[PDB]
Structures are given as C-alpha cells and as structure tokens.
Amino acid sequence: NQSSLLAEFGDPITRVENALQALREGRGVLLLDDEDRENEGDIIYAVESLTTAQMALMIRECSGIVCLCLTEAQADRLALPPMVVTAFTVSIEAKHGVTTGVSAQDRVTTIKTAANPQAKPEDLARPGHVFPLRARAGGVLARRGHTEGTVDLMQMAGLQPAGVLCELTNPDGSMAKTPEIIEFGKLHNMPVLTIEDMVQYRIQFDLKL
Amino acid sequence: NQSSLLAEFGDPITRVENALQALREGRGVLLLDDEDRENEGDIIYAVESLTTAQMALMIRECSGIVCLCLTEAQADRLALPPMVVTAFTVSIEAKHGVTTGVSAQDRVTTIKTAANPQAKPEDLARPGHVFPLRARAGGVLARRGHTEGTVDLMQMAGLQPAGVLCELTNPDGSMAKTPEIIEFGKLHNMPVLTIEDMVQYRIQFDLKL
Ligand SMILES: O=C(CO)[C@@H](O)[C@H](O)COP(=O)(O)O
Ligand SMILES: O=C(CO)[C@@H](O)[C@H](O)COP(=O)(O)O
Ligand SMILES: [Mn+2]
Ligand SMILES: [Mn+2]
C-alpha cells in the first residue's frame, strides 16, 4: 500500500512540514496525486529560488513538458487565456534574454519573467516552450491537482505563489510510480508527499490561503 | 568549421542519401539547421515506424517537447488551427487508448492517431502533450526549418509525410552543438545532416515534392 511505503517519510503532517521546509531552503519536493487519478509524481520547485541546474534536472528526469503554475490573478495580469476554448494557457517565451527558448537557462528566464509580480503581457512572446497552468481558487481543497498542490505549497511555505512542475519519468519512458518516486527522492534528497496529505493538513490546520 | 566536422559523414549528397536510407530502415537521423539560425540539432523519426523505445530515447536525450510535423493538409484534416493568432497548432492527445498522455507509449499512440491518413478531428482531444507543427508548402526550399526538413525527408524517402522531432539537449541543460551532435550520432548510429545539405540536394536533383 502507498501509505505504508510513504511511512518512511513520516506521518502525513510531517510529510507536509518537511516539504514546506525544503521549499523554504530552495530545494525541490516530489508530489504524488491520488492513486485513482493520474497516480503520477511531479518534481516541484519554487520559482523564487529556481536555478538552471534544477531546470536541467527536471528536463533530464521528467517528461520535459515543464509547466509554470500561476494564480488566476497572475495569469490574468499576463493576459494568458486558455489554450483551448488541465488548465493550459497558451505557451510562453520571454521576449528578451533568451535565444531559442528551449535551453534550461532560457526556460528559467521565461519562468522568472512570467512570475514577476510586476510583469506585463508584452514581457512574453506566445507561443513558446514554457507551459503555464492556472490553479483553481481554493487550491487542493477545490481541485486535487498537482497544479493546485504546487501553488498551495508555495503559499503555505510563505513564498511567492508560483512554482514549476513536471512528471517524473522512468528511463524506458513509462511514468514513475510510488516505488520509483520514493527512490528518486532519497537519491536526490527531496521529500515526498501526496495531495491527500495536503488536503488533510489544510483542513485540520483550518488553513485558508 | 562545421562543414569540416561533418566531412566524416560523407559529402552533402551522401549525408542526405544516408539519412534517407536510415529513415527507410526505421532508424532516426540528426538534423542541424543553419549555424546563424537556431544552430540546433533535432532527433528525427518517421511516424510510420515509430516505437515506444524511440520515443523514450527522444524524451531522455532531448528537450522533451516532442513535436509532430504534419503537412498543412493533414493539420487541416485534423481541424488544428494555430495555437496563437514556429507554426505550433493547439496541442493534442489521442481521445482513446491513452491514460495521462505523457508516457512514451501514450505519445506514440497520440502521434499515430493524428498522422493516420484516415484520421478525423474527433480522434484527438485538445489540449494534450503532443505538439503538432505545420510544415510550409515547398519544404526547405520555402522555409529552412527542422519542421520542413522533417516532412521533406519523409517524402524524399518514399514514406508517409509525417515525422517527429525534438531538440538534442546536453545533460547540464544546454542545447547540443555540432561536436555533441556528431558524437551522439556515432553513439546511436544515426546519420547527421544539415538543412543546407537538403536544400542543395533538392535543387540539384530538381526535386519538387
Ligand atoms: O498534464 C499535465 C501537464 O502537462 C497536468 O495534468 C500535470 O501533469 C499535473 O497537472 P494536474 O492535472 O495534476 O493539476
Ligand atoms: O521550437 C521548436 C519546437 O518546440 C521549433 O523551433 C523546433 O525547435 C524546430 O522547428 P523549426 O523552427 O526549425 O522548424
Ligand atoms: Mn499531474
Ligand atoms: Mn528547430
């Protein structure tokens, strides 16, 4: 069972608290959603402390379709409508400071441009190679997605409410499952937690955000 | 100089002919565009012979933003308008036969669904995790992009005019340059060629497609 495999990381409240602390230290975490949903684990990083080396690891070890989780307000500031009349907006590229936009450094530059609380729509070309996602108001208490988990995690840690995610992928191209996620987290010193963990945590610590 | 580094692979005409033969054998090739353009090398595969293991290699070794190069006609058949009023359409997912769409197998399933000459728009959900690109009519003699190179390569090899591409990426997240591309091609037995090679080839062999 998954709850028994995660015991190693502590009880649910500890798993949340350890994840929040890692984010405050500028490290990444591994977030699993429900087993009966996608049953996938994403690498999560805070935008505020995002480095080229973190982005390189995400590209190397995950699907490479690296997403920027934004508040509805920030996506509205950037004039990012849904890509289609998972809440993908149109993809984005920094208008300045990048070349082709695909390199790890370029993606970070685009992400920081987009997440800047003083950003303007002209700051971003469209389309590009970073994929923004709109988190639902209410976070994981409204939608149990990694998108909401990501932004909720940043808010609960006291950070700017923007993060990046990408799905952990096995070398043979299949999606990592809990055993593989646990091993990856130990290898890279990243705490593991679930959306369930965050839901119980927010409810019991009566935590509106 | 790049032309001297590629000499190992044969003269320009040989580099084209070797690439075409690899595609007919169901193997991949490495296509470089102009040094003063993106100066990037993409892994290219024919859709017709695409395997999960080929897709896994692309995700592992490239940006992970794996693109499906289509004729304008095929994109029109699928009712794929531009993602924005590089010719990205809206992203796509197979409507059937996939789970979350990100796994190597799922991407291949989506690609084969989209490239089927009998496909219908209802076959594809939007958005998704495969990114189609419209090749310009005229191919590399109209636009010197990897998008056109990909589709031109399939036509010249006598294959269905659909291929996939993705940008070769170094482990540190920078984009591979010619030395690294050459080494990768030797390691994985993939021929290397340039868009320039294909332009001279099409012009001299007076090759409309
Ligand atoms: O497919 C995607 C992003 O490409 C999303 O589904 C992410 O995989 C996680 O997003 P959630 O749906 O869990 O919020
Ligand atoms: O950025 C992209 C795809 O994400 C494209 O630019 C590809 O990198 C190659 O396409 P071309 O512009 O060379 O046709
Ligand atoms: Mn997810
Ligand atoms: Mn390119």
Side-chain angles (χ1 to χ4, degrees):
Chain A
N1 57 105
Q2 163 179 277
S3 149
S4 89
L5 288 165
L6 295 165
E8 337 172 23
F9 285 83
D11 53 60
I13 302 96
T14 292
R15 294 201 291 262
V16 167
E17 303 277 12
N18 283 350
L20 295 174
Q21 186 54 27
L23 295 170
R24 294 175 200 114
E25 296 168 10
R27 304 189 280 129
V29 304
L30 292 151
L31 181 62
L32 282 163
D33 75 328
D34 297 317
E35 283 184 80
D36 67 1
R37 193 170 175 274
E38 308 182 278
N39 191 28
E40 289 179 345
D42 298 3
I43 294 175
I44 314 296
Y45 294 117
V47 164
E48 188 177 324
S49 48
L50 187 65
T51 66
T52 297
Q54 289 174 336
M55 177 63 60
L57 175 62
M58 184 153 24
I59 293 161
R60 203 159 59 231
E61 304 290 354
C62 302
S63 76
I65 301 163
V66 175
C67 295
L68 168 62
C69 304
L70 297 180
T71 63
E72 304 263 9
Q74 184 70 9
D76 282 345
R77 161 179 285 272
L78 301 171
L80 290 170
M83 186 206 294
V84 176
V85 311
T86 310
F88 283 97
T89 73
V90 60
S91 56
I92 57 164
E93 217 87 278
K95 203 166 285 186
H96 311 278
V98 296
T99 54
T100 71
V102 200
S103 78
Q105 176 182 106
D106 277 9
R107 299 202 213 186
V108 169
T109 292
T110 293
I111 284 158
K112 300 236 191 221
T113 298
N116 168 11
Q118 292 325 94
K120 291 193 227 51
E122 55 164 17
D123 291 348
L124 299 172
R126 314 97 194 281
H129 298 82
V130 170
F131 305 89
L133 298 162
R134 280 170 182 271
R136 297 261 306 268
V140 303
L141 303 182
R143 179 175 184 272
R144 295 169 70 93
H146 298 94
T147 303
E148 283 77 25
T150 292
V151 175
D152 273 5
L153 278 171
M154 306 302 147
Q155 302 191 121
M156 288 190 267
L159 305 172
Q160 276 300 281
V164 291
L165 65 70
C166 199
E167 310 93 334
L168 189 66
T169 301
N170 295 320
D172 70 2
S174 64
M175 299 319 288
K177 296 297 156 183
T178 302
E180 282 68 52
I181 295 163
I182 298 269
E183 178 72 3
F184 190 86
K186 294 163 150 167
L187 175 59
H188 294 274
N189 190 31
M190 313 165 97
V192 177
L193 81 162
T194 70
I195 292 277
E196 173 60 25
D197 293 338
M198 304 183 54
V199 171
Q200 305 167 17
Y201 187 101
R202 291 194 52 198
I203 289 173
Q204 311 261 68
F205 290 89
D206 177 28
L207 210 75
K208 173 178 77 117
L209 309 162
Chain B
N1 57 105
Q2 163 179 277
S3 149
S4 89
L5 288 165
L6 295 165
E8 337 172 23
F9 285 83
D11 53 60
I13 302 96
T14 292
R15 294 201 291 262
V16 167
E17 303 277 12
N18 283 350
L20 295 174
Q21 186 54 27
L23 295 170
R24 294 175 200 114
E25 296 168 10
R27 304 189 280 129
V29 304
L30 292 151
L31 181 62
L32 282 163
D33 75 328
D34 297 317
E35 283 184 80
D36 67 1
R37 193 170 175 274
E38 308 182 278
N39 191 28
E40 289 179 345
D42 298 3
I43 294 175
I44 314 296
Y45 294 117
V47 164
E48 188 177 324
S49 48
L50 187 65
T51 66
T52 297
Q54 289 174 336
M55 177 63 60
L57 175 62
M58 184 153 24
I59 293 161
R60 203 159 59 231
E61 304 290 354
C62 302
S63 76
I65 301 163
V66 175
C67 295
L68 168 62
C69 304
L70 297 180
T71 63
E72 304 263 9
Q74 184 70 9
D76 282 345
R77 161 179 285 272
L78 301 171
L80 290 170
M83 186 206 294
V84 176
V85 311
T86 310
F88 283 97
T89 73
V90 60
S91 56
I92 57 164
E93 217 87 278
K95 203 166 285 186
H96 311 278
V98 296
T99 54
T100 71
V102 200
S103 78
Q105 176 182 106
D106 277 9
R107 299 202 213 186
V108 169
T109 292
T110 293
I111 284 158
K112 300 236 191 221
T113 298
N116 168 11
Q118 292 325 94
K120 291 193 227 51
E122 55 164 17
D123 291 348
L124 299 172
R126 314 97 194 281
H129 298 82
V130 170
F131 305 89
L133 298 162
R134 280 170 182 271
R136 297 261 306 268
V140 303
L141 303 182
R143 179 175 184 272
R144 295 169 70 93
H146 298 94
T147 303
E148 283 77 25
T150 292
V151 175
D152 273 5
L153 278 171
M154 306 302 147
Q155 302 191 121
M156 288 190 267
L159 305 172
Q160 276 300 281
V164 291
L165 65 70
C166 199
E167 310 93 334
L168 189 66
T169 301
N170 295 320
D172 70 2
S174 64
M175 299 319 288
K177 296 297 156 183
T178 302
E180 282 68 52
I181 295 163
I182 298 269
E183 178 72 3
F184 190 86
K186 294 163 150 167
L187 175 59
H188 294 274
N189 190 31
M190 313 165 97
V192 177
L193 81 162
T194 70
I195 292 277
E196 173 60 25
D197 293 338
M198 304 183 54
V199 171
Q200 305 167 17
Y201 187 101
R202 291 194 52 198
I203 289 173
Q204 311 261 68
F205 290 89
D206 177 28
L207 210 75
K208 173 178 77 117
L209 309 162

